[PDB]
Amino acid sequence: YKAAGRQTSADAISDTGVDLLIDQEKSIDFLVDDIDRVQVAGSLEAYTRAGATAL
Amino acid sequence: YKAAGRQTSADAISDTGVDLLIDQEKSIDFLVDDIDRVQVAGSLEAYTRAGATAL
Known part of the structure; x- marks a missing residue:
């Protein structure tokens, strides 16, 4: 100033x-695959949880 | 995507x-041997426990 x-x-x-x-x-x-869903030893729900974990 | x-x-x-x-x-x-089992100074049960312990 x-x-x-x-x-x-x-x-x-x-x-x-x-x-x-x-x-x-x-x-x-x-x-x-819905042939695999019949033939596998138990539930395949785990791949939906793996997809959410991957995002 | x-x-x-x-x-x-x-x-x-x-x-x-x-x-x-x-x-x-x-x-x-x-x-x-069942002559030995009588002639020894005491019990031979310890050989069964040795066998179980070895497995």
């Missing part, structure tokens, strides 16, 4: 910014 | 496995 005489004049305010993009689209897609 | 256009096609599920073999067959086989 002392170097500017004793003068002050107002400045214009300004902003920065960044973008968060919802740009990831990922999928799980698989077959439970 | 985004690099694939917006397409998805199903996979075959697949498994892993291991087999446990009941292939070990071990024995103990011994004689107690």
Whole structure:
């Protein structure tokens, strides 16, 4: 202020910014063959849990 | 799913496995002479416990 005489004049305010993009689209897609569902020794439900864990 | 256009096609599920073999067959086989069983200073039962402990 002392170097500017004793003068002050107002400045214009300004902003920065960044973008968060919802740009990831990922999928799980698989077959439970219904011949295999009959022939296997027990339940195949575990592959649905493995798919959720993989995502 | 985004690099694939917006397409998805199903996979075959697949498994892993291991087999446990009941292939070990071990024995103990011994004689107690029935002159000795009488002539010795005490019980010979300890030889049965030795045999069980060895298996």
